[PDB]
């Protein structure tokens with residue numbers, strides 16, 4: 001019974017409804033943005049999320065992302081900035097997470113994110129300490145706030161509870177709150193509360209998103225080194241594979 | 250009769266109504282964001298915009314900006330990126346321009362912008378060619394699109410028509426359009442059409458905004474060189490002065 | 499293969515997503531409003547709409563209705579108005595119709611409706627002539643506008659094409675248009691265009707809705723005669739039955 | 748210093764900004780709806796509201812109303828309903844009240860209202876007992892809820908505090924709450940809290956609005972008796988006069 005993919009109908013209903021919800025909330029979703037890469041399922045064992053559906057409230061790692069911008073911002077940069085340009089750029093995405101579902105534990109070496117809740121409430125789990133890079137000095141300025149301890153009773157995905165162990169800091173964001181920054185190199189994950197009557201909708205503004213995915217397999221590289229560059233490190237190895245392509249049957 | 254400032258009542262009605270409009274459109278406006286620096290008047294001779302008011306449709310250079318984010322994004326950066334970090338960072342602002350009014354001709358040496366129209370329509374004027382920097386190689390990737398010629402009959406601010414001479418390329422953006430990128434070092438300006446029944450509301454996502462203004466006079470500098478760093482070059486000298494502080498009587 | 503009901507999962511995903519879309523558009527949807535009567539399927543042979551789903555674009559008669567108000571407005575009425583009070587009252591509902599789907603041909607003897615498109619576009623089909631009531635004088639004031647002829651290529655539900663024969667007048671309504679009135683005793687139906695990227699969402703403001711349905715089976719009758727009073731006359735007999743209760747398996 | 752009218756500029760800025768706010772909130776505001784009758788000032792001594800402006804927070808009786816529908820709903824009615832048709836009909840309006848301002852104490856003999864808060868919060872004051880009509884039996888069904896006592900510290904308009912004496916019941920409505928019904932013949936008034944950061948925006952759905960005002964002076968009467976029929980009874984005589992026409996200088 002363990003699902004190994006998502007049917008074309010399950011996929012379209014999930015993604016097209018999400019796109020409509022996005023438009024209702026005034027996010028600029030174009031036709032190209034609504035594709036077979038928008039709906040993400042993090043790992044083969046997470047396809048079981050569609051056993052009972054996106055409204056079951058069950059804890060699984062899957063989400064939708066509509067990307068309206070992923071600008072390298074390389075034009076006009078002095079040549080000397082070429083080796084550090086990968087830490088910059090501008091990316092705008094709308095993220096939709098259903099009740100109980102999660103964006104899994106991971107960190108980026110180059111990308112810094114910010115969250116703006118548009119609908120529902122966002123429960124963020126993260127590590128206030130950066131993931132030290134092997135022998136290399138890093139800049140510091142504000143660091144990350146310690147936050148609060150996890151509330152009791154958070155249901156985690158079966159077979160991936162341990163991937164959340166280090167994301168000890170917690171914060172619950174709501175529409176209207178100040179923008180929340182997630183510095184690069186910091187472990188983070190988030191979910192929509194299981195009792196939510198609406199999907200969690202969040203506007204993410206971050207630096208460039210290096211992701212040689214399926215729908216991202218067809219773009220000239222602004223800088224040589226950027227080609228094939230990956231910047232997503234999932235704590236769970238099971239969440240790495242299926243992140244770059246959803247199995248639609 | 251030439252106004253030299255804006256009365257406290259004229260200012261508050263302009264800025265508080267704009268903040269409410271922003272909230273209606275779901276932009277996360279906090280209390281701190283609604284201040285005496287949000288309403289901008291570009292030059293002493295532009296205060297005459299309040300002679301007949303923000304609904305006269307007359308061409309003047311004045312606008313409102315609510316900044317929800319201006320993150321240096323320096324944390325986690327390798328030390329070697331310190332000299333180029335100023336070209337990165339993340340800034341999120343909501344801009345409100347009334348009928349006939351303009352955000353004046355200017356360019357940034359370090360900041361790259363992107364526009365998302367939320368309400369009304371945006372008429373952008375710009376130069377598809379970058380403002381060459383004295384003896385220094387720059388990176389290139391996509392450059393700027395040539396766009397279209399200006400439509401006929403655009404009323405420019407009296408005494409500043411020449412500042413628009415070089416911004417020969419034109420594009421009209423609407424809600425739902427793809428995000429529009431304005432690369433750093435490119436001259437640009439924009440206005441709300443004079444016949445618009447609503448103020449132009451635009452979400453701007455850009456790299457860090459270096460602006461030692463009035464409300465920005467009180468923040469630790471992430472990197473030494475950033476202190477007192479200016480990154481706004483207005484074509485009109487008249488628009489430089491009053492950009493950093495609105496005279497409220 | 500002919501579906502005879504809708505599964506609990508198909509129902510909830512359809513109705514809960516619709517409720518979320520409604521909230522995003524600012525319609526006041528309460529918990530009680532999201533129930534097993536909100537999703538309507540007009541006839542046993544229309545359950546096949548869930549063969550390929552609400553995003554197939556296929557022509558079927560099914561829709562969702564969230565009722566926020568159905569006030570008799572009997573309080574304060576002079577006793578003499580008791581026999582005509584049934585033509586008054588106030589009803590506020592949000593209607594959601596998916597691509598290609600229809601609200602089937604029908605007329606009301608007592609209820610007058612009005613439409614306000616919130617999202618998408620509404621294609622209304624109707625008869626500009628009232629359905630004459632057996633021997634009884636009726637008041638007239640504005641009547642209904644003749645409208646336009648049907649555009650070519652409208653796909654109707656298989657086995658119910660004839661029910662649309664008399665609804666010869668056509669009008670396409672969009673968000674922002676003047677409110678459109680549908681006088682009582684006039685045949686009407688409507689659909690969401692099959693090529694729409696979003697479900698059609700319409701705010702309906704009408705006089706009292708007399709409907710002894712499933713979720714409506716439990717309310718004191720303001721006036722004696724109102725008890726068990728029906729006011730929905732479907733052109734297709736097949737659309738009458740399943741209108742009062744959706745078969746959820 | 749006692750203002751006796753509102754300047755053309757004060758009026759337009761108030762009304763045009765309100766119309767834009769309405770559009771942002773998705774209310775279908777057409778060009779005709781934005782006129783010189785939309786902004787209402789209840790009495791000559793209330794023009795002082797523009798002494799310090801709509802953002803002063805001072806208690807004054809003035810508001811804006813955009814009417815999208817006022818349908819007699821007479822078509823299709825049996826002739827015998829002619830004498831009671833005036834209690835029916837359908838009216839849809841968007842009401843905008845600024846901080847501290849009020850819609851003054853009044854009751855309608857024929858019109859029953861309902862409120863839906865779209866933005867901000869609405870503080871309603873009313874009498875749970877109907878205004879008995881001289882020798883005439885009236886129907887009853889749900890009556891009005893007793894509500895709660897007034898919170899302490901409500902600032903009333905100077906020179907009109909007594910008009911509120913009988914409106915002893917209180918209820919505070921917010922966006923998302925169930926629709927609130929105000930039965931005909933019941934005294935009612937409401938205000939936007941003085942500390943609100945946004946104007947109060949409310950969708951009103953009611954039966955026909957009989958109002959021989961300024962912008963309403965030019966429509967055929969559906970039924971003979973309706974001609975010149977008035978249905979607004981203000982507790983304060985000072986609020987009656989200027990209700991039908993705003994003095995714009």
Ligand SMILES: O=C[C@@H](O)[C@@H](O)[C@@H](O)CO
Pocket residue numbers: 065093103113188204209232
């Ligand atoms: O935190 C989430 C961000 O990394 C998103 O843009 C995706 O990469 C999550 O997989």
Ligand SMILES: O=C[C@@H](O)[C@@H](O)[C@@H](O)CO
Pocket residue numbers: 314342352362437453458481
């Ligand atoms: O183009 C406009 C941007 O530069 C804004 O953030 C302001 O700096 C305009 O003065």
Ligand SMILES: O=C[C@@H](O)[C@@H](O)[C@@H](O)CO
Pocket residue numbers: 563591601611686702707730
């Ligand atoms: O035209 C549609 C209205 O009658 C709705 O309230 C429902 O009764 C449609 O079945």
Ligand SMILES: O=C[C@@H](O)[C@@H](O)[C@@H](O)CO
Pocket residue numbers: 812840850860935951956979
């Ligand atoms: O309660 C307010 C309603 O009566 C409105 O439509 C206006 O008539 C208020 O003057």
Ligand SMILES: OC[C@@H]1O[C@@H](O)[C@@H](O)[C@H]1O
Pocket residue numbers: 011012015016031034035036
């Ligand atoms: O609307 C675009 C279509 O819908 C999405 O499911 C994409 O797969 C694309 O095929």
Ligand SMILES: OC[C@@H]1O[C@@H](O)[C@@H](O)[C@H]1O
Pocket residue numbers: 052053055056057506507510511
């Ligand atoms: O909410 C949709 C349905 O109800 C829930 O119980 C899930 O199991 C799913 O099948």
Ligand SMILES: OC[C@@H]1O[C@@H](O)[C@@H](O)[C@H]1O
Pocket residue numbers: 127129130131132166187
């Ligand atoms: O131990 C300090 C750092 O913070 C935690 O997130 C760990 O991953 C480690 O990299």
Ligand SMILES: OC[C@@H]1O[C@@H](O)[C@@H](O)[C@H]1O
Pocket residue numbers: 260261264265280283284285
């Ligand atoms: O709501 C905040 C106040 O309104 C704005 O006018 C700011 O000046 C601040 O004083």
Ligand SMILES: OC[C@@H]1O[C@@H](O)[C@@H](O)[C@H]1O
Pocket residue numbers: 301302304305306755756759760
């Ligand atoms: O729109 C507001 C008023 O009308 C316009 O004519 C301007 O002059 C201003 O005074």
Ligand SMILES: OC[C@@H]1O[C@@H](O)[C@@H](O)[C@H]1O
Pocket residue numbers: 376378379380381415436
């Ligand atoms: O002449 C090429 C460049 O483009 C234009 O914008 C000028 O400012 C110049 O700097």
Ligand SMILES: OC[C@@H]1O[C@@H](O)[C@@H](O)[C@H]1O
Pocket residue numbers: 509510513514529532533534
């Ligand atoms: O959220 C309320 C639940 O969802 C809807 O499916 C209703 O059936 C009700 O059971």
Ligand SMILES: OC[C@@H]1O[C@@H](O)[C@@H](O)[C@H]1O
Pocket residue numbers: 008009012013550551553554555
């Ligand atoms: O849009 C969802 C899927 O795609 C359409 O082709 C329908 O058949 C349905 O199965």
Ligand SMILES: OC[C@@H]1O[C@@H](O)[C@@H](O)[C@H]1O
Pocket residue numbers: 625627628629630664685
């Ligand atoms: O024939 C005139 C009327 O208009 C049409 O709608 C028919 O139903 C009939 O009742």
Ligand SMILES: OC[C@@H]1O[C@@H](O)[C@@H](O)[C@H]1O
Pocket residue numbers: 758759762763778781782783
């Ligand atoms: O936009 C319509 C104009 O604005 C409002 O002030 C009305 O008076 C009308 O003249």
Ligand SMILES: OC[C@@H]1O[C@@H](O)[C@@H](O)[C@H]1O
Pocket residue numbers: 257258261262799800802803804
């Ligand atoms: O909010 C606008 C200004 O500030 C308030 O104090 C009022 O007096 C008005 O003049």
Ligand SMILES: OC[C@@H]1O[C@@H](O)[C@@H](O)[C@H]1O
Pocket residue numbers: 874876877878879913934
């Ligand atoms: O005294 C009962 C009624 O209720 C109150 O509102 C009074 O106006 C009176 O008409």
